[PDB]
Swiss-Prot record, chains F, J:
Superkingdom in the source lineage: Eukaryota
Effect of F24S: In HPRI; Los-Angeles
Full protein stretch here: 25 to 54 of 110
Gene: INS
Lineage: Eukaryota, Metazoa, Chordata, Craniata, Vertebrata
Record-given protein name: Insulin B chain
Effect caused by changing R22Q: In MODY10; reduces binding affinity to INSR; reduces biological activity; reduces folding properties
UniProtKB/Swiss-Prot annotation, chain G:
Lineage: superkingdom: Eukaryota
Lineage: Eukaryota, Metazoa, Chordata, Craniata, Vertebrata
The protein's name: Insulin B chain
Effect of F22S: In HPRI; Los-Angeles
Length: 21, 28, 29, 21, 21, 30, 28, 21, 21, 30, 29, 21
């Protein structure tokens, strides 16, 4: 999930953009 | 708990990044 | 419109807290 | 949607709960 | 205290409601 | 230390949300 | 708006008040 | 209330200190 | 400046990136 | 004005996120 | 490191509040 | 810099004032 991917390691804005609708 | 705090920042980041189209959030 | 953007910022934190483990769908429009 | 309901007037947590998954 | 309870483990909102007036 | 301080920041936001009109009291230590 | 502003107020108080804490009562 | 006093007009940090206990 | 440009209407993150040093 | 204060609060968080490692200056005057 | 990002996020809000009209600089590294 | 000073141990608001313009 997003929590495991972005809270253990740092995510880029581009990775976060995958979760936009 | 740290992840819960992180999640709070995550959703704000998602909000800013995604803008008009919005987003889907879940901690799976 | 800026006020709606500002409101949305607070809304999503409220949702994060209320919805807990279930997560949520955020759609402005 | 949520912006219509909850930005023009103050929604309760129970109202906000409607937009959860 | 609220810090001792809710910053060590995750409190529910009902638990957090105990700190309301 | 830091994360206690940071955590309380999120607690007060959560209490603001949860307590709404009722309001709340925050005293960290105890 | 007032509702949103109070959210910033309580964060300002948390920060100004430090270990003393504070009481937030939006009608007193 | 603090909301009327500090959201209509800007409060200084000194004025906010009044609401600390 | 930034207040007049981005608090009147919404600025994207791309636009805001111009204020980074 | 408080509405500008509130908008600024969100602006600096947005700047923090986008600028990252690089950082930023924030001056509401100019 | 994520903790550092989280700390910086709170730091900039605090600086915003404290510095007022003067404004501030956030330069992490 | 600010990170080493304030993210390792907590800074007062008056120490954070060193990073005002
Ligand atoms: C922007 C952001 C916030 C929280 C965690 C991350 O990996 C990234
Ligand atoms: C808690 C909250 C945030 C934003 C709008 C609302 O109606 C309610
Ligand atoms: C910061 C925070 C919010 C909600 C529950 C908690 O245990 C902690
Ligand atoms: C510091 C602060 C935040 C919000 C409103 C105010 O009047 C003052
Ligand atoms: C991200 C953001 C915050 C505040 C105002 C804006 O135009 C944009
Ligand atoms: C107010 C604040 C936020 C983050 C770190 C600090 O040392 C102090
Ligand atoms: Zn706000
Ligand atoms: Zn945080």
């Amino acid at each position: 999930g997003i929590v495991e991917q972005c809270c253990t390691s740092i995510c880029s804005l581009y990775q976060l953009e995958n979760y936009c609708n | 708990v740290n992840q819960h705090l992180c999640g709070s920042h995550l959703v704000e980041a998602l909000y800013l990044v995604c803008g008009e189209r919005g987003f889907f959030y879940t901690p799976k």
